[PDB]
């Protein structure tokens, strides 16, 4: 039997958020000049001539 | 008829390379004006007579609006 009051509830939520799916599009990224590019050992790669 | 035309066309030993030079200078000069609104590194330019193309690389991925605004 339908009791109107007992069937009533209050539903919570967050107010007015915005969901961003992609996550790296906000990153702009650049490389050092590849002639002067260096490895883990603090010693240049592509240096022998 | 005789018309004043103090400019360049073909029919000369000089016209080809010199037009290539002038287009190179023109595009090098223009391409240093897009720099007022974008950051890019000119990777390659080619000029051959009746056409020319320049490639350029960005700090990020390309969008429609950058293409449109660059074109304008």
From TrEMBL, chain A:
Site for Interaction with the intermediate capsid protein VP6, residues: 8, 10
PTM annotation, UniProt: Sumoylated with SUMO1 and SUMO2. Sumoylation of viral proteins seems to have a positive role on viral replication.
Location within or outside the cell: Virion
Signal peptide, first to last residue: none
Record comment regarding domains: The N-terminus binds RNA. It is necessary for encapsidation of VP1 and VP3. The N-termini of 10 VP2 molecules form a cylindrical hub underneath each 5-fold axis of the inner capsid.
Subunit-structure text: Homodecamer; each decamer is made up of two conformers of VP2, called VP2A and VP2B. Interacts with a VP1-VP3 complex. Interacts with the intermediate capsid protein VP6. Interacts with NSP5. Interacts (via N-terminus) with NSP2.
Family the UniProt entry places it in: Belongs to the rotavirus VP2 family.
Function: Inner capsid protein that self-assembles to form an icosahedral capsid with a T=2 symmetry, which consists of 120 copies of VP2, with channels at each of its five-fold vertices. This capsid constitutes the innermost concentric layer of the viral mature particle. It encapsidates the polymerase VP1, the capping enzyme VP3 and the genomic dsRNA, thereby defining the core.
Entry protein name: Inner capsid protein VP2
Automatic annotation (TrEMBL), chain B:
Top-level taxon of origin: Viruses
Cellular location(s): Virion
Family: Belongs to the reoviridae RNA-directed RNA polymerase family.
Job description of the protein: RNA-directed RNA polymerase that is involved in both transcription and genome replication. Together with VP3 capping enzyme, forms an enzyme complex positioned near the channels situated at each of the five-fold vertices of the core. Following infection, the outermost layer of the virus is lost, leaving a double-layered particle (DLP) made up of the core and VP6 shell. VP1 then catalyzes the transcription of fully conservative plus-strand genomic RNAs that are extruded through the DLP's channels into the cytoplasm where they function as mRNAs for translation of viral proteins.
Subunit and interaction comment: Interacts with VP3 (Potential). Interacts with VP2; this interaction activates VP1. Interacts with NSP5; this interaction is probably necessary for the formation of functional virus factories. Interacts with NSP2; this interaction is weak. Interacts with VP3. Interacts with VP2; this interaction activates VP1. Interacts with NSP5; this interaction is probably necessary for the formation of functional virus factories. Interacts with NSP2; this interaction is weak.
Protein name per its UniProtKB record: RNA-directed RNA polymerase
Native source organism of the sequence: Rotavirus A (strain RVA/Monkey/United States/RRV/1975/G3P5B[3]) (RV-A)
Full-protein interval shown: 582 to 653 of 1088
């Amino acid at each position: 039997q339908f009791d109107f009051r007992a069937s009533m509830h209050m539903l919570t939520s967050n107010l007015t958020f915005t969901v961003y799916s992609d996550l790296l599009a906000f990153v702009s990224a650049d490389t050092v000049e590849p002639i002067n590019a260096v490895a883990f050992d603090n010693m240049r790669i592509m240096n022998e001539l | 008829k005789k018309i004043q035309y103090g400019a360049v066309a073909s029919g000369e030993k000089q016209t080809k390379a010199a037009n290539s030079i002038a287009n190179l200078a023109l595009i090098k000069t223009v391409l240093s004006r897009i720099s007022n609104k974008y950051s890019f590194a000119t990777k390659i330019i080619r000029v051959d007579g009746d056409d020319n193309y320049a490639v350029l690389q960005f700090n990020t991925e390309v969008t429609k609006q950058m293409v449109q605004d660059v074109s304008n």
